[PDB]
Amino acid sequence: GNTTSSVILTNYMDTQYYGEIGIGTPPQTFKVVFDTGSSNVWVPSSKCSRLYTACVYHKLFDASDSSSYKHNGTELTLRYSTGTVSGFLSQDIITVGGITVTQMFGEVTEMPALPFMLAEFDGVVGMGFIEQAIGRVTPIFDNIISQGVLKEDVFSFYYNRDQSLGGQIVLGGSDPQHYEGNFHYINLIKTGVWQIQMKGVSVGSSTLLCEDGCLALVDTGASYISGSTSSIEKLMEALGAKKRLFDYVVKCNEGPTLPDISFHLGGKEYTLTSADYVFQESYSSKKLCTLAIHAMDIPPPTGPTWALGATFIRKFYTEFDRRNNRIGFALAR
C-alpha cells in the first residue's frame, strides 16, 4: 500500500475530459473518460463494423495482437444518458499510469454516430460501484483495490479550465499542486453510487431550489451541472437566461452581472460565480453565451437527481473515497 498512479487528462472544450489507458500485451492505447457515473470499462473493438462511422474515427482494440487476452464473449448493452453502446466482454491486462490490472471490459461493436461521432475519446473506464456495473462485472478500481498497492482506497480528479494541463486523475491519493487548503468531505447517502445529499441550491443569498433537500450525483463523465427540467427551468428564470432552440443563453456582456450559484453540501456552501458557469466565449453585447448548466432528467432509481459534473469539478478538485464512502472537495487551482 505505497503507490499512486496519475493519468494526465486532455480537456476538450471544457465538456470532455479523458486520458489514456493501455489494454493488452503489448499495451494498445485508448483515450478514455474516467466516469464516476458508471462502472463498466469498454473501448471500441476491431470487430466493430466500419459502417458505424465512430469505428472509423476511433481506435479499435485488436484482441489477436494481445498475448494476455482471454476470451469471454458475453454480450452487454450499456445505456448512458447521451447514448447506447453494445458489445461483448473480454479480459486482458489494463495499464493505468504506473498500475497494471487484469480487467474484464467491453469490446464495443455498436457505436452510433449520436453521440460517439462527437466523442473525442474512444471509450470509458467506469469509476462507480459494482452495484451499477452491467453484468455485475468487477469494476477496475475494485480490482486495483484487491492488489493492495494503493496508498489509499481513493481517487481524485482535477479538471482544468480551457498549453496547460487539461486535467489529472490520481489513483491512490490526491495531488496538492492542483488544490488549495484541505478537503471537506460529504458522506454518501448509501453505498453503490457516488451520490450525496444536497441541502439547498442558492441564487445569490436566496435558496430558490432544493429547499427540502435533494440528491447530487458527483459525476466525472458529465459535462455540466445538471438538475431536473423543472429545477433548471426555475434556475434559469431566476438568472434571466432564455432557451435558445437547444440550450439556455444570456447576452455575453450580461454574464458578469449574474449572481453566484451555491450548492449546499455537507454543511458547506460550494459557490460558483458566473465566470464558473457561463461559457464566456465572448463578452459582447452582440453575442449570446451558453451556460454550463443543463436540464437532465435522470431516471430512477439513481434519479431524479442533480448531477455535479465537470462544471462543478473545475471549481472543486474532487476526491472519491471508497474506504469511507464519501466525496472530498477542495478549491481547484
Ligand X SMILES: c1coc(CNc2ncnc3sc4c(c23)CCCC4)c1
Ligand Y SMILES: *[C@@H]1O[C@H](CO)[C@@H](O)[C@H](O)[C@H]1NC(C)=O
The verdict on whether 212 is a catalytic residue reads: no
Closer residue to ligand X (CB): 58 or 326: 58
For residue 209, give the H/E element and its range: strand 206-209
| Three-state DSSP state, 199 | coil
Q: What mask of x and - would describe binding to ligand X in positions 274 to 313, judged by CB under 6 A?
A: -----------------------------------xx---
Q: Say if CB 239 and CB 251 are below 8 A apart.
A: no
Q: Which residue of the chain is nearest ligand X when measured via CB?
A: 221
Count of CB atoms situated within 10 Å of the CB of 211 = 11
Which 70-99 positions form the footprint of ligand X (CB under 6 A)?
80, 82-83
> Which range binds ligand Y by CB under 6 A, 130-138, 166-174, 220-228, 256-264?
130-138
| Three-state DSSP state, 115 | helix
> Which range binds ligand Y by CB under 6 A, 50-58, 132-140, 242-250, 253-261?
132-140
Q: Is 35 in the site for ligand X (CB under 6 A)?
A: yes
Tell me how far apart the alpha carbons of residues 192 and 194 are, in angstroms, rounded to a whole number: 7
Q: Say if CB 198 and CB 264 are below 8 A apart.
A: yes
The verdict on whether 321 is a catalytic residue reads: no
Which 225-244 positions form the footprint of ligand X (CB under 6 A)?
none
Question: What backbone torsions phi and psi does residue 121 show, to the nearest 5 degrees?
Answer: -90, 165
Please compute, for residue 167, the number of CA atoms within 13 A of its CA located in the half-sphere on the CB side. 33
For ligand Y, which residue of 32, 89, 171, 238 counts as binding (CB under 6 A)? 89
Which 177-206 positions form the footprint of ligand Y (CB under 6 A)?
none
Tell me how far apart the alpha carbons of residues 320 and 333 are, in angstroms, rounded to a whole number: 18
> Which range binds ligand Y by CB under 6 A, 133-141, 189-197, 201-209, 223-231?
133-141
Tell me how far apart the alpha carbons of residues 293 and 323 are, in angstroms, rounded to a whole number: 31
For ligand Y, which residue of 53, 67, 74, 324 counts as binding (CB under 6 A)? 74
- Binding residues with ligand Y: total (CB under 6 A): 6
> Which of ligand Y, ligand X, none lies near 330, with the C-beta cut-off 5 to 8 A by kind?
none
Q: Which three cell numbers stand for residue 321?
A: 473515497
Q: Is 16 in the site for ligand X (CB under 6 A)?
A: yes
> Which of ligand Y, ligand X, none lies near 74, with the C-beta cut-off 5 to 8 A by kind?
ligand Y
Q: Is 33 in the site for ligand X (CB under 6 A)?
A: yes
The closest of 266, 277, 263, 265 to 310, measured between CA atoms, is 277
Question: What backbone torsions phi and psi does residue 226 show, to the nearest 5 degrees?
Answer: -130, 155
For ligand Y, which residue of 83, 112, 115, 135 counts as binding (CB under 6 A)? 135
> Which range binds ligand X by CB under 6 A, 13-21, 56-64, 141-149, 322-330?
13-21
Of 35, 92, 153, 321, the catalytic one is: 35
Closer residue to ligand X (CB): 124 or 149: 124
Q: Answer positive or negative: Cα dihedral of 140, 132, 157, 115.
A: positive
Tell me how far apart the alpha carbons of residues 31 and 10 are, in angstroms, rounded to a whole number: 9
Tell me how far apart the alpha carbons of residues 130 and 269 are, in angstroms, rounded to a whole number: 31
- Alpha helix ranges (H) inside 164-309: 229-239, 274-277
Closest separation between CB of residue 41 and ligand Y, Å?
Answer: 12
> Which of ligand Y, ligand X, none lies near 304, with the C-beta cut-off 5 to 8 A by kind?
none
One-letter amino acid of 165: L
Q: Which residues are tagged catalytic?
A: 35, 219
Q: Which residues bind ligand X (CB under 6 A)?
A: 15-17, 33, 35, 38, 80, 82-83, 115, 118-119, 124, 221-223, 309-310
Q: Which residues bind ligand Y (CB under 6 A)?
A: 72, 74, 89, 135-137
